Design brief:
Structural class: mainly alpha
Entry title: refined structure of the pore-forming domain of colicin A at 2.4 angstroms resolution
Assembly: monomeric
Number of domains: 1
CATH superfamily: Colicin
Helix content: over 70%
Largest sheet: none
Name: colicin A
PDB class: antibacterial protein
Order of helices and strands: HHHHHHHHHH
CATH architecture: Orthogonal Bundle
Keywords: antibacterial protein
Length: 197
């Protein structure tokens, strides 16, 4: 495609928006990491997402960071925000943003992101979420589209968040880390250095 540039572009718009909403509580530095992330997405055509192993590496700099120990209430607010997602519904809304989100079995992709995010919050194991994306690329979905979909999904969840402010802060941080991991380890260092500490 050339219409891959389509999906990529409408997706960075969601990441940039995530950056505004969440920048309101975390600040300008966050607004900036999120927008730098959204430009990478924007111009990802022809690049390939980073390896399952490189990905867990950058992500672990974040999740394994003591300032990131999430409390149960927070963890319960974020899980519930996911359990309230209706994948068909969510697939349909992305469909309205653009034809290009109408990829083969998008409803199940969504549903897997949802379920493995829930697992991530509940057991602190981010492996299954990461392995889910990479496996779409291992199976033939263009890195562009995998990134695309993964990203829009997490961008839409974050935009719809209605949880307390500390909770939106912590979500926003892990959502930038999950996405950032597929792209450049730079993102992990910037969230770490500029925000978490």
């Amino acid at each position: 495609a050339k219409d891959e540039r389509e999906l990529l572009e409408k997706t960075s718009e969601l990441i940039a928006g995530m950056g505004d909403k969440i920048g309101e509580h975390l600040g300008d530095k966050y607004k900036a990491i999120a927008k730098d992330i959204a430009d990478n997405i924007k111009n990802f055509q022809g690049k390939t997402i980073r390896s399952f192993d490189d990905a867990m590496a950058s992500l672990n700099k974040i999740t394994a960071n003591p300032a990131m120990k999430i409390n149960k209430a927070d963890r319960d607010a974020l899980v519930n925000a996911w359990k309230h997602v209706d994948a068909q519904d969510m697939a349909n809304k992305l469909g309205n943003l653009s034809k290009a989100f109408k990829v083969a079995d998008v409803v199940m992709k969504v549903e897997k992101v949802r379920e493995k995010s829930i697992e991530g919050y509940e057991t602190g194991n981010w492996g299954p979420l990461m392995l889910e994306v990479e496996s779409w690329v291992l199976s033939g979905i263009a890195s562009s589209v995998a990134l695309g979909i993964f990203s829009a999904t997490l961008g839409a969840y974050a935009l719809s968040l209605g949880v307390p402010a500390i909770a939106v802060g912590i979500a926003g941080i892990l959502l930038a880390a999950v996405v950032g991991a597929l792209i450049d380890d730079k993102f992990a260092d910037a969230l770490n250095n500029e925000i978490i500490r």
